[PDB]
Amino acid sequence: MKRLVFISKISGHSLEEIQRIGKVSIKNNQRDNITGVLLYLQGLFFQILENEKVDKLYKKILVDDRHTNILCLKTEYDITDRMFPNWAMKTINLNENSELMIQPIKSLLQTITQSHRVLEKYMPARVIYLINQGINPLTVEPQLVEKIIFFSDILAFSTLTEKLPVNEVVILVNRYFSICTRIISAYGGEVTKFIGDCVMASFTKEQGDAAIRTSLDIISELKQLRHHVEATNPLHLLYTGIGLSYGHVIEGNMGSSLKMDHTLLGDAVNVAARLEALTRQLPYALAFTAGVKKCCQAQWTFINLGAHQVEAIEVYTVNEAQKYYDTLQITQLIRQTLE
Amino acid sequence: MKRLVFISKISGHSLEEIQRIGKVSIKNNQRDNITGVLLYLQGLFFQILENEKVDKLYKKILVDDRHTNILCLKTEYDITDRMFPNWAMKTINLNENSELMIQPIKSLLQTITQSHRVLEKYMPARVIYLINQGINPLTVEPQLVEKIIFFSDILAFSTLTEKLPVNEVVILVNRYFSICTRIISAYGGEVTKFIGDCVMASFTKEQGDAAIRTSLDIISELKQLRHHVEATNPLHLLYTGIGLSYGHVIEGNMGSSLKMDHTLLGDAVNVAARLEALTRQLPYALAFTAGVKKCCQAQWTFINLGAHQVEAIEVYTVNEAQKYYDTLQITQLIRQTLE
Ligand SMILES: Nc1ncnc2c1ncn2[C@@H]1O[C@H](COP(=O)(O)OP(=O)(O)OP(=O)(O)O)[C@@H](O)[C@H]1O
Ligand SMILES: Nc1ncnc2c1ncn2[C@@H]1O[C@H](COP(=O)(O)OP(=O)(O)OP(=O)(O)O)[C@@H](O)[C@H]1O
Ligand SMILES: [Mg+2]
Ligand SMILES: [Mg+2]
Numbered sequence: 001m002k003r004l005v006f007i008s009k010i011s012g013h014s015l016e017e018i019q020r021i022g023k024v025s026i027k028n029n030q031r032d033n034i035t036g037v038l039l040y041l042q043g044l045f046f047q048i049l050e051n052e053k054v055d056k057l058y059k060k061i062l063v064d065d066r067h068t069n070i071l072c073l074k075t076e077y078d079i080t081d082r083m084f085p086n087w088a089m090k091t092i093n094l095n096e097n098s099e100l101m102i103q104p105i106k107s108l109l110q111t112i113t114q115s116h117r118v119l120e121k122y123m124p125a126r127v128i129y130l131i132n133q134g135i136n137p138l139t140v141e142p143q144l145v146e147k148i149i150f151f152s153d154i155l156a157f158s159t160l161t162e163k164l165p166v167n168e169v170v171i172l173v174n175r176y177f178s179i180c181t182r183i184i185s186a187y188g189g190e191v192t193k194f195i196g197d198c199v200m201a202s203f204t205k206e207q208g209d210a211a212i213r214t215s216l217d218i219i220s221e222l223k224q225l226r227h228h229v230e231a232t233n234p235l236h237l238l239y240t241g242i243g244l245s246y247g248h249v250i251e252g253n254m255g256s257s258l259k260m261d262h263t264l265l266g267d268a269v270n271v272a273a274r275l276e277a278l279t280r281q282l283p284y285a286l287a288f289t290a291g292v293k294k295c296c297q298a299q300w301t302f303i304n305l306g307a308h309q310v311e312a313i314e315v316y317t318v319n320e321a322q323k324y325y326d327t328l329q330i331t332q333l334i335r336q337t338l339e
Numbered sequence: 340m341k342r343l344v345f346i347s348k349i350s351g352h353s354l355e356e357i358q359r360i361g362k363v364s365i366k367n368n369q370r371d372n373i374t375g376v377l378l379y380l381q382g383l384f385f386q387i388l389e390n391e392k393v394d395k396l397y398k399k400i401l402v403d404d405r406h407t408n409i410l411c412l413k414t415e416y417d418i419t420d421r422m423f424p425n426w427a428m429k430t431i432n433l434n435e436n437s438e439l440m441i442q443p444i445k446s447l448l449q450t451i452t453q454s455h456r457v458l459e460k461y462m463p464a465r466v467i468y469l470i471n472q473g474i475n476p477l478t479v480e481p482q483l484v485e486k487i488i489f490f491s492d493i494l495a496f497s498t499l500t501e502k503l504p505v506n507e508v509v510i511l512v513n514r515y516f517s518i519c520t521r522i523i524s525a526y527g528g529e530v531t532k533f534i535g536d537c538v539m540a541s542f543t544k545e546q547g548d549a550a551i552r553t554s555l556d557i558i559s560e561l562k563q564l565r566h567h568v569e570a571t572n573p574l575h576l577l578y579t580g581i582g583l584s585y586g587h588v589i590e591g592n593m594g595s596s597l598k599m600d601h602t603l604l605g606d607a608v609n610v611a612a613r614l615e616a617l618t619r620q621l622p623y624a625l626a627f628t629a630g631v632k633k634c635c636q637a638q639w640t641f642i643n644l645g646a647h648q649v650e651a652i653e654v655y656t657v658n659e660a661q662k663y664y665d666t667l668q669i670t671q672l673i674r675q676t677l678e
């Protein structure tokens with residue numbers, strides 16, 4: 001046995017089709033004997049739901065497109081008594097309930113759930129992943145894991161924004177984070193956090209190739225963006241450098257009882273930051289260590305860029321990361337553009 | 340008119356005293372004509388509540404000690420119709436309600452509220468402050484503000500932890516963040532975020548003196564800690580450096596639609612980080628710019644430490660921040676301790 005709960009959003013749009021997934025889960029879940037409740041209010045869904053067969057149903061539920069923005073808040077494992085024995089799937093429409101003594105519970109539910117969804121926008125992806133897995137993210141114990149650490153950072157951001165109005169800097173930073181986050185997430189990396197004009201993320205050791213392709217993809221999308229936009233647009237001089245390193249880091253909850261953060265700690269972090277900063281003076285936009293090189297299996301053309309200090313380490317790149325430009329020239333071009 | 344809502348925790352412990360704040364707010368709120376609802380479930384409180392007189396009541400409510408961990412989720416301003424006209428304060432104990440059709444709404448409420456409180460532990464203090472003020476923190480528009488930027492950072496953290504087990508590094512980092520956060524918050528600064536072994540925070544320009552005292556207090560609490568603990572404890576070699584700068588920075592929501600962060604962007608950020616890093620080579624543990632100096636009104640003994648590069652800027656400190664040690668000696672002492 002096991003119980004699990006999630007909340008959801010509006011994806012599409014009808015008085016009826018509730019009854020579809022009602023009728024269906026009603027007859028479906030009795031062939032498979034699961035019990036649960038569907039509640040709906042002001043365009044939010046809430047659902048409660050053996051141990052194996054309830055996952056054939058969940059794997060259907062997320063891939064179900066009648067709702068988007070699915071977060072499994074809770075999961076209980078090997079339970080003893082079901083919460084809703086006789087209900088194969090009871091659907092409750094709390095917009096239709098106007099009883100005077102249910103409005104309070106109805107209004108709080110509305111208010112705390114909407115607040116909760118605003119807070120999810122500030123959460124580390126690793127905390128949201130924990131939560132979805134039914135793990136309490138505040139009591140996980142920190143573990144030493146192996147990671148490829150990723151750092152990407154805007155070239156001459158001070159100069160590029162030093163003359164822009166507030167809203168235009170924010171638009172530019174957001175676009176940059178938006179393009180980085182999407183490609184990282186598509187290749188199976190997790191963003192760890194944002195630092196100024198800078199994206200920090202990690203990949204596993206089975207994902208080296210995916211870490212170079214991310215890097216290359218990001219470089220590629222910005223070169224497209226720069227000629228997609230007009231020359232008076234700030235996006236026209238948006239460049240990045242990218243640093244990658246490999247190593248054992250600590251992943252866990254860190255901080256006082258007041259504020260918690262869930263992050264990665266280790267020297268690899270520092271090394272990726274510096275290889276990133278080191279691209280500025282390289283004829284390449286991507287720089288990485290030998291450890292990253294050995295996580296790769298594709299026939300990259302690896303170029304050895306010598307040993308550098310942070311005990312100096314070998315640095316490498318791929319031919320595909322050669323810059324079509326000269327990094328000093330780009331930044332005076334950046335200073336000339338806004339006088 | 341205005342309505343406001345909050346949630347709360349257990350502070351102390353009785354079947355009766357509900358009726359106290361029941362009876363009291365019942366007669367109290369009718370002298371002042373406010374309407375609202377108190378709900379209680381599994382040790383959580385929820386309350387809904389003219390425009391002026393409801394703040395005499397809130398200012399009582401937080402200072403009321405029967406509950407801790409108060410967060411004002413919502414606030415509506417100049418409303419037209421009250422939600423609960425005839426209820427001066429209706430108290431609803433949802434632990435006593437066993438109706439079969441209320442258990443769902445009861446279980447969800449429980450589940451989403453508990454999740455919500457776990458997420459608050461990951462929120463930036465500035466987002467929580469916005470929320471408490473009734474401002475939607477995801478639509479605030481970014482503003483240029485003036486800030487003293489604070490950076491504090493552990494001396495030789497790599498060396499100090501390079502031989503420790505995972506749990507001991509986390510204990511040490513947590514203690515360090517815990518001591519920093521408490522003193523910063525006591526002096527009216529907000530932590531902005533944690534970066535590795537490093538605390539980032541800000542103060543206003545009216546709070547320079549408070550920024551030096553924080554810095555000095557932190558240095559002081561760690562020197563106490565080091566001789567409070569045994570010499571085999573890692574806390575015995577915990578030191579910090581602190582950098583302060585002043586400047587216009589952008590404060591706002593930054594990122595893609597996936598992840599949002601609420602933070603400060605500007606060159607002052609970079610300058611505080613470097614003055615911090617610069618203490619490592621100084622005979623002082625605190626370093627700051629002229630801009631910080633002019634935010635101070637107390638008769639500090641300001642020591643001019645010359646001009647330094649990051650166009651080189653003047654750097655200053657206070658006599659009270661002189662180190663009783665030599666920064667090279669401390670780190671070999673740190674390497675000798677764990678062989
Ligand atoms: N932890 C942080 N939080 C917020 N902003 C930061 C942080 N660290 C740096 N910044 C800011 O990010 C901006 C960019 O700094 P950065 O060091 O990337 O210089 P740059 O102008 O982009 O030159 P480069 O080509 O070396 O990147 C600066 O305004 C800096 O203060
Ligand atoms: N953005 C980050 N996120 C997580 N960890 C980080 C970050 N930046 C640095 N670190 C890690 O923090 C640790 C301390 O690095 P730091 O640069 O403070 O060196 P240190 O050993 O403390 O020497 P110093 O006396 O110069 O501080 C390193 O393991 C580093 O990789
Ligand atoms: Mg940059
Ligand atoms: Mg940067």
Ligand SMILES: [Mg+2]
Pocket residue numbers: 492493494495496536
């Ligand atoms: Mg340090």
Ligand SMILES: [Mg+2]
Pocket residue numbers: 492493534535536537
């Ligand atoms: Mg550091």
